[PDB]
Design an enzyme around this catalytic site. Structure first.
Site: not given
Ligand SMILES: *CCC(=O)N1CCCC[C@@H](n2c(NC(=O)c3cccc(C(F)(F)F)c3)nc3cccc(C)c32)C1
Length: 287
Positions: A132, A136-137, A150
């Protein structure tokens, strides 16, 4: 057939604070291991089959250690099981290029291509097909440092898919028709990934539904040349999209190629105008 001696850390619910919801379910939080004088910023991802899936992801995420792979810190067992990961403050790279397109330069783009290729080539070293890979990942720790994440659909060694929902437009042709997945199948998705970055987040085959994608590529059609892309860069995308999987490039070659170009970025991408005291990041917390 080497024994996987990764450690799985079970964390106490009391050791971490959940500040806020980042998306939908992931939360920003702080992890304070007992009496260790540190605070780790973390992302917490909070039905029997559902726990089976989530623990399979923790299995894979705990067996990888690479600066461009997402790091699992631990799990917490609860009514609902939680994965605890390193916080990526800038979110996913797809949203990031979409929001800062007018201030992203050629050198950041090329260095993201190098870093992702490094992550993938490390996952290939450990015999892991991601399945995947997509913008986005890929998450952003800092604008200078991205990490692959992911892989709930990641599997470990061809491989034969069963019934899961699939991205299709990120997928190699053999995957779509025969549910075959290889490291070279990953390289295809890498090519689509690079294409979403070079278009600043455009949707591949926008306004086409997945039903037709199979015949479209059978006909010899591919994704277009992004405007900022010299033929040098675009030719590498096209190589990731050959029908012969062995004719497509190897992740270690992609590292080299994008590294070469990262030493002189404006030759390869043409872009207008390119010109809370004791906190520890998880990349500095090892034991
Ligand atoms: C593409 C969408 C997006 O930005 N994402 C998808 C998941 C929602 C959380 C968003 N986000 C994070 N994520 C993480 O810090 C993170 C770390 C390790 C694993 C994952 C996982 F696998 F679950 F997705 C996520 N950090 C932030 C900071 C600011 C804004 C956003 C939206 C954000 C990431």
């Amino acid at each position: 057939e080497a024994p996987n001696q990764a450690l799985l850390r079970i964390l106490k619910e009391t050791e971490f604070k959940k500040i806020k919801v980042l998306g939908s379910t992931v939360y920003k939080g702080l992890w304070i291991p007992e009496g260790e004088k540190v605070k780790i910023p973390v992302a917490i991802k909070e039905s029997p089959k559902a726990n089976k899936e989530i623990l399979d992801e923790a299995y894979v995420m705990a067996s990888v250690d690479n600066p461009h792979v997402c790091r699992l810190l631990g799990i917490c067992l609860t009514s609902t099981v939680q994965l605890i990961m390193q916080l990526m403050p800038f979110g996913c790279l797809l949203d990031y290029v979409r929001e800062h397109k007018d201030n992203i330069g050629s050198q950041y783009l090329l260095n993201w291509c190098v870093q992702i290729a490094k992550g993938m080539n490390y996952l290939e070293d450990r015999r892991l097909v991601h399945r995947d890979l997509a913008a986005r990942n890929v998450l952003v720790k800092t604008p200078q440092h991205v990490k692959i994440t992911d892989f709930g659909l990641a599997k470990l060694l061809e491989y034969h898919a069963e019934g899961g929902k699939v991205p299709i437009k990120w997928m190699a042709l053999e995957s779509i028709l025969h549910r075959i997945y290889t490291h070279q199948s990953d390289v295809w998705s890498y090519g689509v990934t690079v294409w979403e970055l070079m278009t600043f987040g455009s949707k591949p085959y926008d306004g086409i539904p997945a039903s037709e994608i199979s015949s479209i590529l059978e006909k010899g059609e591919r994704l277009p040349q992004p405007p900022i892309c010299t033929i040098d860069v675009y030719m590498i995308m096209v190589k990731c999209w050959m029908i012969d999987a062995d004719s497509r490039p190897k992740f270690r070659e992609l590292i080299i190629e994008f590294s070469k170009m990262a030493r002189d970025p404006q030759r390869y991408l043409v872009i207008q105008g390119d010109e809370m005291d004791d906190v520890v990041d998880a990349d500095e917390y090892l034991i």
